[PDB]
Amino acid sequence: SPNYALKFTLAGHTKAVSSVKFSPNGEWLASSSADKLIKIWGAYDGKFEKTISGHKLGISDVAWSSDSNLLVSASDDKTLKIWDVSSGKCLKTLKGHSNYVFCCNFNPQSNLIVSGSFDESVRIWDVKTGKCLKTLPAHSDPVSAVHFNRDGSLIVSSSYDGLCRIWDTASGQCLKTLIDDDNPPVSFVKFSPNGKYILAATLDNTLKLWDYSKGKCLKTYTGHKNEKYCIFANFSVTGGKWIVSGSEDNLVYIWNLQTKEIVQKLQGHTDVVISTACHPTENIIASAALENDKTIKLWKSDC
Amino acid sequence: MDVFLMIRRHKTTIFTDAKESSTVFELKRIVEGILKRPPDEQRLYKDDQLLDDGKTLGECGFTSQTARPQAPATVGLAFRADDTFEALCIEPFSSPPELPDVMK
Amino acid sequence: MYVKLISSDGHEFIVKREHALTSGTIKAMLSTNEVNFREIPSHVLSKVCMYFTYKVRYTNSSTEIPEFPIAPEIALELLMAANFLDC
Amino acid sequence: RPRPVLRSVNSREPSQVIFCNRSPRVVLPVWLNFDGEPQPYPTLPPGTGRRIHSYRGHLWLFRDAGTHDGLLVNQTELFVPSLNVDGQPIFANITLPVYTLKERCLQVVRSLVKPENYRRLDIVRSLYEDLEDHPNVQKDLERLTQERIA
């Protein structure tokens, strides 16, 4: 059982914090906010490093390149931006979506970016040029999450249409849809570290681990509240194998991956915890909360 | 095609209906049933046009859209006894008061 | 099957009994088959009779039903009559 | 969570419907959402029809857009789309009810007299109250659920 304890609260943003992500090298935390800013913080001391600005509206998500040198951000302004973290300089503005961009991620090789939008499309972008290479519009309602698998060969997307789709990156063609029964809106998805499974959240207060190839659900995690916001979830692998998610009751839940038992609830936030991230090497969680809170918290555990 | 009529004489108004294919004679038979005067003692009129017994109501210009339930057409009636023919005389209805200020 | 309704100014309206029985007030008044209306003049009662025709014709119709038209000048006295007659 | 009986079901099963305005009124379609809350849709001028995308088990009623007088659809108050059979859309024929003379007169006086002037009218007080009892959806849903119990 882990024993995460609060180490720091980070109160830079003036609005809802939308997303927190650790750099793959472990040094930095990036945060994004409805206040149009990205902030960079020291991962270990929570020390503010810089503000990155340029988006004309609220930011929904940020993601790191594999070498921790680049960020991409997804904005209500209908754009993504590629940034050089050292300079704070917008290298490229990705134009093409026709409504709010909600989610983004680089592939492992970090030559591509994938995005999803309220406009119901997934796009693949060239990082060097900033050109849209493909538009994948099969979803019939907003896209909530997009993720590359461990070698970049697949993308998974989640939608309010109630499907997850698996896409072949090279062709753009959809290989698989996961339609489970009732298909409540899907609010989050990503691939497991081993690439064989997908963790999906639905707005019926449920997280499921899916063997996507076989279309069968291995695990379900419940006890939290998730019926309105698109709350991120994580695999914690540095100590014990856990699933980490925020909750609309203002707590961070941590589940045993295998048993599905709630092992810990992190108390502290004063609004919905919309985002959580797990440090790549250390037992550290960052959580971020909505308008009545506007803070990031860093938590640390012995396992 | 049904037609809706007011048959009018003096200060009497009969509401009735008939078919566009109905004849003027059939209208007089309706009138006879109510007012107890046979058809030969009855003259029917559209405005000031005397109506022929053998014509249909449609042939006289009584149409489904000029003779509606909520807006019936007027037939004038005047009686006849032997060689004495009563003139067509239809007493008009009352009139409403001036429209109140708050309703303009 | 016909009844006579007489306005305050002495006009006589002869309408099918079924039509008149649209008004529950008139049904009570008939419990004679002539009725007098001390406070409804002919321009208003003529219009009431047109309503009865309209009502009986288009109730249970499944047709296009036209509007029952009411000029502003008569609306207030027709409201009062409709209220009295419960139709 | 307890919800009103009068609400759409989220069937997610499509139904093509023709809203056919066979009324002389500008028609307001009103969709009852999954909570039973009324939602206004775009209006239809008299003499018009539109083919529209709805769903099985959804719940509609129709009013006069300007006055909220209640109208009928296929001779009743509420319209529920079912499953299209054989490529054919479901007609929703919107018609005037046969209003009572009294209601029709109230409609007309309301259209002529501003509400603050109702009580300047030389009429009995019970009619002031009738004029002020404006038709609306809230009131009818109440009636329609009261009726439903028998």
Short mmCIF file of C-alpha atoms in Angstrom, two decimals, chain A:
data_model
loop_
_atom_site.label_atom_id
_atom_site.label_comp_id
_atom_site.label_asym_id
_atom_site.label_seq_id
_atom_site.Cartn_x
_atom_site.Cartn_y
_atom_site.Cartn_z
CA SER A 1 0.00 0.00 0.00
CA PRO A 2 1.63 3.39 -0.98
CA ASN A 3 1.82 6.30 1.44
CA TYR A 4 1.77 9.39 -0.76
CA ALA A 5 2.12 12.56 1.35
CA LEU A 6 1.79 16.19 0.23
CA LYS A 7 5.18 17.87 -0.43
CA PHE A 8 4.20 21.08 -2.31
CA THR A 9 1.30 23.20 -3.59
CA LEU A 10 1.94 25.41 -6.67
CA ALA A 11 -0.29 28.44 -6.96
CA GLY A 12 0.93 30.24 -10.12
CA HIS A 13 -2.20 29.91 -12.31
CA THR A 14 -5.19 32.30 -12.04
CA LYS A 15 -7.75 29.84 -13.44
CA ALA A 16 -8.45 26.11 -13.72
CA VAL A 17 -5.36 24.01 -14.29
CA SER A 18 -6.10 21.64 -17.20
CA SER A 19 -3.06 19.37 -17.43
CA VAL A 20 0.19 18.45 -15.72
CA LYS A 21 2.93 16.33 -17.30
CA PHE A 22 6.46 15.40 -16.16
CA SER A 23 9.35 15.67 -18.64
CA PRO A 24 10.63 12.18 -19.69
CA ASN A 25 14.04 13.06 -18.16
CA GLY A 26 12.36 13.65 -14.77
CA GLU A 27 13.51 17.23 -14.25
CA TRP A 28 10.42 19.32 -15.01
CA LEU A 29 6.67 19.54 -14.61
CA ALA A 30 4.67 21.42 -17.25
CA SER A 31 1.23 22.77 -16.38
CA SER A 32 -1.44 24.23 -18.72
CA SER A 33 -4.43 26.37 -17.69
CA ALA A 34 -7.65 28.06 -18.72
CA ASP A 35 -5.53 31.21 -18.12
CA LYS A 36 -3.78 30.69 -21.48
CA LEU A 37 -0.42 29.94 -19.89
CA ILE A 38 1.97 27.04 -19.69
CA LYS A 39 4.23 27.05 -16.60
CA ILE A 40 7.37 25.01 -16.04
CA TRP A 41 8.21 23.87 -12.47
CA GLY A 42 11.09 21.92 -10.93
CA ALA A 43 9.82 18.33 -10.55
CA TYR A 44 11.53 17.78 -7.17
CA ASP A 45 11.12 21.20 -5.44
CA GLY A 46 8.06 22.70 -7.19
CA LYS A 47 10.12 25.81 -7.97
CA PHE A 48 8.58 27.94 -10.76
CA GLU A 49 10.99 28.05 -13.72
CA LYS A 50 9.13 29.98 -16.46
CA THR A 51 5.83 31.01 -18.04
CA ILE A 52 5.27 30.14 -21.76
CA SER A 53 2.59 32.25 -23.51
CA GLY A 54 1.09 32.96 -26.92
CA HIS A 55 -2.24 31.06 -27.01
CA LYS A 56 -5.19 33.44 -27.44
CA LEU A 57 -7.54 31.29 -25.30
CA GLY A 58 -7.52 28.63 -22.53
CA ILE A 59 -5.17 25.62 -22.86
CA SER A 60 -6.54 22.10 -22.47
CA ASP A 61 -3.39 19.96 -22.64
CA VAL A 62 0.42 19.92 -22.99
CA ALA A 63 2.80 17.10 -23.85
CA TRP A 64 6.61 16.57 -23.94
CA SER A 65 8.88 15.32 -26.73
CA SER A 66 10.89 12.19 -25.80
CA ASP A 67 14.10 14.25 -25.35
CA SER A 68 12.31 16.77 -23.07
CA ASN A 69 13.34 19.66 -25.42
CA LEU A 70 9.88 20.36 -26.92
CA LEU A 71 6.32 20.91 -25.67
CA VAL A 72 3.07 20.83 -27.68
CA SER A 73 -0.05 22.60 -26.33
CA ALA A 74 -3.70 22.20 -27.34
CA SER A 75 -5.91 25.31 -27.07
CA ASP A 76 -9.52 26.47 -27.19
CA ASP A 77 -8.09 28.89 -29.79
CA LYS A 78 -8.34 25.92 -32.25
CA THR A 79 -4.56 25.66 -32.52
CA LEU A 80 -1.71 23.62 -31.19
CA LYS A 81 1.72 25.18 -30.59
CA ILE A 82 5.12 23.54 -30.65
CA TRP A 83 7.51 25.23 -28.15
CA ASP A 84 11.23 25.04 -27.41
CA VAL A 85 11.23 24.65 -23.57
CA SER A 86 14.64 26.40 -23.10
CA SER A 87 13.53 29.55 -25.00
CA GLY A 88 9.76 29.62 -24.44
CA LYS A 89 9.68 30.21 -28.18
CA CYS A 90 6.75 29.11 -30.31
CA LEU A 91 8.47 27.17 -33.12
CA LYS A 92 5.20 26.31 -34.95
CA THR A 93 1.46 27.00 -34.76
CA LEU A 94 -0.60 24.00 -35.97
CA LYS A 95 -3.71 25.27 -37.78
CA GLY A 96 -6.44 23.05 -39.21
CA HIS A 97 -8.91 22.13 -36.47
CA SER A 98 -12.17 24.06 -36.68
CA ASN A 99 -12.98 24.00 -32.98
CA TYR A 100 -11.35 23.66 -29.54
CA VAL A 101 -8.31 21.36 -29.47
CA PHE A 102 -8.56 19.26 -26.28
CA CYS A 103 -5.66 16.77 -26.30
CA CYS A 104 -2.19 16.17 -27.75
CA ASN A 105 0.82 13.87 -27.64
CA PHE A 106 4.09 13.30 -29.48
CA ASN A 107 5.01 9.88 -30.82
CA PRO A 108 8.09 8.16 -29.26
CA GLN A 109 10.28 9.17 -32.19
CA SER A 110 8.84 12.71 -31.70
CA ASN A 111 8.65 13.49 -35.44
CA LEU A 112 4.81 13.43 -35.19
CA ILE A 113 2.11 15.00 -33.02
CA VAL A 114 -1.44 13.65 -32.67
CA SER A 115 -4.37 15.81 -31.56
CA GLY A 116 -8.09 15.49 -30.91
CA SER A 117 -10.73 18.25 -31.08
CA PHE A 118 -14.33 19.19 -30.29
CA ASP A 119 -14.54 19.19 -34.09
CA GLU A 120 -14.66 15.35 -33.82
CA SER A 121 -11.36 14.82 -35.70
CA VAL A 122 -8.00 13.36 -34.86
CA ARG A 123 -5.11 14.93 -36.77
CA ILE A 124 -1.51 13.84 -37.27
CA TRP A 125 1.07 16.61 -37.67
CA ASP A 126 4.63 16.86 -38.97
CA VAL A 127 6.76 18.32 -36.15
CA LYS A 128 9.55 19.70 -38.41
CA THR A 129 7.16 21.46 -40.85
CA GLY A 130 4.03 21.97 -38.69
CA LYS A 131 1.85 20.69 -41.59
CA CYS A 132 -1.25 18.50 -40.96
CA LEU A 133 -0.40 15.13 -42.56
CA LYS A 134 -3.72 13.35 -41.95
CA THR A 135 -7.22 14.00 -40.68
CA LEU A 136 -9.08 11.02 -39.17
CA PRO A 137 -12.76 12.05 -38.79
CA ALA A 138 -14.53 8.76 -38.00
CA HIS A 139 -15.60 9.91 -34.49
CA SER A 140 -19.10 11.40 -34.33
CA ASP A 141 -18.64 13.55 -31.20
CA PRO A 142 -15.73 15.43 -29.49
CA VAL A 143 -12.40 13.63 -29.02
CA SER A 144 -11.28 13.60 -25.36
CA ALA A 145 -7.85 11.84 -25.58
CA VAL A 146 -5.24 10.68 -28.11
CA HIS A 147 -2.13 8.56 -27.49
CA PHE A 148 0.65 6.79 -29.41
CA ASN A 149 1.63 3.24 -28.48
CA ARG A 150 5.17 2.40 -27.42
CA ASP A 151 6.71 2.28 -30.96
CA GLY A 152 4.45 4.91 -32.62
CA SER A 153 2.72 2.43 -34.94
CA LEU A 154 -0.78 2.90 -33.41
CA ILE A 155 -2.88 5.75 -32.06
CA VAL A 156 -5.80 5.29 -29.67
CA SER A 157 -8.51 7.97 -29.48
CA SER A 158 -11.50 8.28 -27.13
CA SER A 159 -14.75 10.09 -27.90
CA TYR A 160 -18.02 11.34 -26.44
CA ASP A 161 -19.58 9.13 -29.16
CA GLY A 162 -18.78 6.29 -26.73
CA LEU A 163 -16.05 4.58 -28.81
CA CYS A 164 -12.35 4.15 -28.52
CA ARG A 165 -10.71 3.72 -31.90
CA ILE A 166 -7.31 2.23 -32.73
CA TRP A 167 -5.67 3.77 -35.80
CA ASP A 168 -2.75 2.61 -37.89
CA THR A 169 -0.42 5.66 -37.89
CA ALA A 170 1.18 4.96 -41.29
CA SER A 171 -2.08 4.61 -43.27
CA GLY A 172 -4.57 6.59 -41.20
CA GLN A 173 -6.96 3.61 -41.35
CA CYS A 174 -8.92 2.55 -38.26
CA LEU A 175 -7.96 -1.00 -37.26
CA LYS A 176 -10.38 -1.52 -34.37
CA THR A 177 -13.22 0.09 -32.48
CA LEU A 178 -13.98 -0.75 -28.85
CA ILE A 179 -17.74 -0.46 -28.44
CA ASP A 180 -18.65 -1.78 -24.97
CA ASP A 181 -22.34 -1.89 -24.04
CA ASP A 182 -24.32 1.30 -23.50
CA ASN A 183 -21.19 3.18 -24.69
CA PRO A 184 -21.26 6.06 -22.17
CA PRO A 185 -19.04 8.96 -23.34
CA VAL A 186 -15.33 8.11 -23.21
CA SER A 187 -13.42 10.84 -21.33
CA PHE A 188 -9.84 9.50 -21.46
CA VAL A 189 -7.76 6.70 -22.96
CA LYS A 190 -4.15 5.65 -23.27
CA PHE A 191 -2.02 2.60 -23.95
CA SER A 192 -0.51 0.56 -21.08
CA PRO A 193 3.35 0.58 -20.79
CA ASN A 194 3.44 -2.87 -22.45
CA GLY A 195 1.31 -1.72 -25.42
CA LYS A 196 -1.05 -4.72 -25.09
CA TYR A 197 -3.85 -2.90 -23.17
CA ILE A 198 -5.73 0.40 -23.01
CA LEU A 199 -6.95 2.24 -19.90
CA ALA A 200 -10.23 4.05 -20.62
CA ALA A 201 -12.45 6.34 -18.50
CA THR A 202 -16.20 6.76 -19.07
CA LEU A 203 -18.52 9.43 -17.61
CA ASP A 204 -20.34 6.78 -15.56
CA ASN A 205 -17.75 6.95 -12.79
CA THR A 206 -15.73 4.02 -14.27
CA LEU A 207 -12.17 3.21 -15.40
CA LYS A 208 -11.59 0.02 -17.38
CA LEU A 209 -8.47 -1.79 -18.52
CA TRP A 210 -9.06 -3.30 -21.99
CA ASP A 211 -7.32 -5.94 -24.01
CA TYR A 212 -8.05 -4.01 -27.19
CA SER A 213 -7.15 -6.71 -29.74
CA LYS A 214 -9.64 -9.16 -28.17
CA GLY A 215 -12.25 -6.51 -27.29
CA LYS A 216 -12.49 -7.90 -23.72
CA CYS A 217 -12.29 -5.88 -20.47
CA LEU A 218 -9.84 -7.26 -17.88
CA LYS A 219 -10.37 -4.80 -14.98
CA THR A 220 -12.66 -2.12 -13.62
CA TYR A 221 -11.77 0.65 -11.12
CA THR A 222 -14.57 2.46 -9.29
CA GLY A 223 -15.33 4.39 -6.13
CA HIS A 224 -14.47 7.81 -7.58
CA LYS A 225 -16.78 10.39 -9.12
CA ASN A 226 -16.45 11.05 -12.87
CA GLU A 227 -19.63 12.08 -14.79
CA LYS A 228 -18.80 15.54 -16.25
CA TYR A 229 -15.06 16.34 -16.64
CA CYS A 230 -12.42 14.61 -18.78
CA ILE A 231 -10.13 13.41 -16.07
CA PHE A 232 -6.73 11.97 -16.96
CA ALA A 233 -5.55 8.62 -15.54
CA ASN A 234 -2.11 7.05 -15.13
CA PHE A 235 -0.19 3.85 -14.66
CA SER A 236 2.16 4.16 -11.65
CA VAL A 237 5.05 1.74 -12.23
CA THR A 238 8.03 3.13 -10.25
CA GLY A 239 7.08 1.33 -7.02
CA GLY A 240 3.86 -0.62 -6.64
CA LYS A 241 1.77 -1.11 -9.79
CA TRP A 242 -1.11 1.32 -9.40
CA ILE A 243 -3.75 3.18 -11.34
CA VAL A 244 -3.97 6.89 -10.51
CA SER A 245 -6.87 9.19 -11.34
CA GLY A 246 -8.45 12.40 -10.15
CA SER A 247 -12.10 12.66 -9.14
CA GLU A 248 -14.99 15.16 -9.11
CA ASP A 249 -15.15 14.83 -5.28
CA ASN A 250 -11.73 16.65 -5.18
CA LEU A 251 -9.59 13.60 -4.29
CA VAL A 252 -6.77 11.70 -6.05
CA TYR A 253 -7.67 7.99 -6.06
CA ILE A 254 -4.99 5.29 -6.24
CA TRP A 255 -6.05 1.70 -6.98
CA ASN A 256 -4.22 -1.61 -6.84
CA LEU A 257 -3.93 -2.51 -10.56
CA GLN A 258 -4.51 -6.26 -10.00
CA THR A 259 -7.00 -6.35 -7.14
CA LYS A 260 -8.88 -3.13 -8.12
CA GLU A 261 -8.99 -2.04 -4.46
CA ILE A 262 -8.72 1.64 -3.61
CA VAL A 263 -5.40 1.78 -1.72
CA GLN A 264 -5.24 5.54 -1.06
CA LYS A 265 -7.25 8.75 -1.44
CA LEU A 266 -5.25 11.99 -1.51
CA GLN A 267 -7.04 14.81 0.29
CA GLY A 268 -6.11 18.44 -0.21
CA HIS A 269 -7.68 19.90 -3.37
CA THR A 270 -10.74 22.19 -3.19
CA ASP A 271 -12.16 21.40 -6.63
CA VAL A 272 -12.27 18.62 -9.26
CA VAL A 273 -8.86 17.04 -9.83
CA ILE A 274 -8.82 16.93 -13.65
CA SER A 275 -5.21 15.88 -14.17
CA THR A 276 -2.65 13.64 -12.53
CA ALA A 277 0.83 12.61 -13.62
CA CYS A 278 3.35 10.08 -12.31
CA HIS A 279 7.06 10.87 -12.31
CA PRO A 280 9.06 8.58 -14.67
CA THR A 281 11.61 7.30 -12.07
CA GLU A 282 10.46 8.40 -8.57
CA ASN A 283 7.29 7.78 -6.62
CA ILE A 284 5.96 11.32 -7.21
CA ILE A 285 2.43 12.30 -8.33
CA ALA A 286 1.34 15.74 -9.56
CA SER A 287 -2.34 16.64 -9.47
CA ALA A 288 -4.06 19.74 -10.81
CA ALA A 289 -7.53 21.14 -10.06
CA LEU A 290 -10.28 23.32 -11.54
CA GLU A 291 -11.51 26.91 -10.98
CA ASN A 292 -12.23 26.90 -7.20
CA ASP A 293 -8.70 25.50 -6.55
CA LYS A 294 -6.36 26.51 -9.42
CA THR A 295 -3.40 24.71 -7.81
CA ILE A 296 -0.99 21.89 -8.60
CA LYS A 297 0.07 19.50 -5.82
CA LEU A 298 3.16 17.32 -5.67
CA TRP A 299 2.91 14.12 -3.55
CA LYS A 300 5.65 11.67 -2.58
CA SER A 301 5.63 8.05 -1.30
CA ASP A 302 8.06 5.31 -0.25
CA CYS A 303 6.52 2.76 -2.66
#
